[PDB]
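Can't attach files on this board, so I'm pasting raw text. These are the components:
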Amino acid sequence: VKSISNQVWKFQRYQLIMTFHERPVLPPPLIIFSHMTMRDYGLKLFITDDELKKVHDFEEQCIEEYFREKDDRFNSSNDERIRVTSERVENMSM
Amino acid sequence: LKGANASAPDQLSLALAWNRVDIARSQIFIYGQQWPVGSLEQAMLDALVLDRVDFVKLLIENGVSMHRFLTISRLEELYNTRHGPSNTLYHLVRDVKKGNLPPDYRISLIDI
Amino acid sequence: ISKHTQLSPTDAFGTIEFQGGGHSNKAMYVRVSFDTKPDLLLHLMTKEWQLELPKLLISVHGGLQNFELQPKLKQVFGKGLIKAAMTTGAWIFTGGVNTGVIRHVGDALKDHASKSRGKICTIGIAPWGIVENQEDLIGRDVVRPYQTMSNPMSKLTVLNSMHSHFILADNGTTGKYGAEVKLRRQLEKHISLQKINTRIGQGVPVVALIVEGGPNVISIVLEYLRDTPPVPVVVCDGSGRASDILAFGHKYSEVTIQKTFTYTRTQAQHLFIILMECMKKKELITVFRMGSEGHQDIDLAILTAL
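---
Top answer:
Structure tokens for the assembled complex are below.
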């Protein structure tokens, strides 16, 4: 229950931040005037072409590193080494 | 493979039908090979229709560029194919189109 | 006409991305004449391309004819070349086009890229008149996609991918070779004269690697041996071409029957004077064999010669 509650609270921070971003400056008791009167950040981030290319290159490098690290971890596991050793020993014996 | 003295496209078609990518790698894509113009794109289309990931990868490794290959008509053909595992696309298209689809209706990119 | 061509400022340089292979590789290129002074090229490489001076300079030569060599030897060759280039800080000089030995070094780069994240500075110096798509490269300081796939019908060849940089040599002729060799040799000699970070007073070491080859490879190795600072030459015995005649002449020498090769105009023509002048300085020659030689690795053989 504690772990699930922590995860749900962390998830629900986002809606609180959005709600207080989309709200008037004044509080309810004195937004009476503001009712009759009626995103550079906080929601998005507008980027230029050169910085967009930089972000794309960074993402490509990250995904390449992720795949390389995953392959390196898999190839050096005990199970894979045992399997390969057994196959090579069988072929060598034959 | 050598039993017909056929062109490399037909050997590639046979290897695609048999789903043996090692044979095509070791017997069809060899040093000094000759390829006609536009045959590899047709091979890529056939491999995409039949859901042959290994053959798609091998064709990409051998000079096929997806930027030049993919057009609107090819994508519409890919969406209107039958040579693959069953999916639930037609039900969604019927639901979005208010269930007024005539028989053998052709799906357009607008519907997608 | 003795190169009746004008001299206009450079029109084709920038960056290219290769489309068609299984990799995503970017290469920097410039189209320049064959009279460019090596100091200007060094300035371009060290400042515009931002390349640190190398501690080693491998200059691979061979036969431009698209050949094939025995398996279990191309793997050893690739492993040794990649290890020698990666462990040290080295620049590799090749032809650049995708034919012959350059195709094999491209394969060696390709198989190593999957297993390791190291970056190797491979520099291709090719004539401008043989690139299959001379267009699609004119965009100054802008990326230009390039098609790795080629049709065998055209006599032109495509620049090999997996090369980090390109220098395109121009003289005025198109569809002809022999317009980049002098610039390559002059740049190599100029780089060798540069002072490495050590304060002993020694310059950058230069070694030459030979695979396959032909008639002009003998002249190249002669000019390397006859250079004012001698350049060690590593030869591969199992290649088959005139490198193999060098390997054979390296054995039980200081027998003209074994010297006869029939390779160039049968027994009527013999490059015997050139071969014997090369074999006079057999201490700088390091023939690599996978058998009796103590150095079974080309990587160990390359560094030991220096």
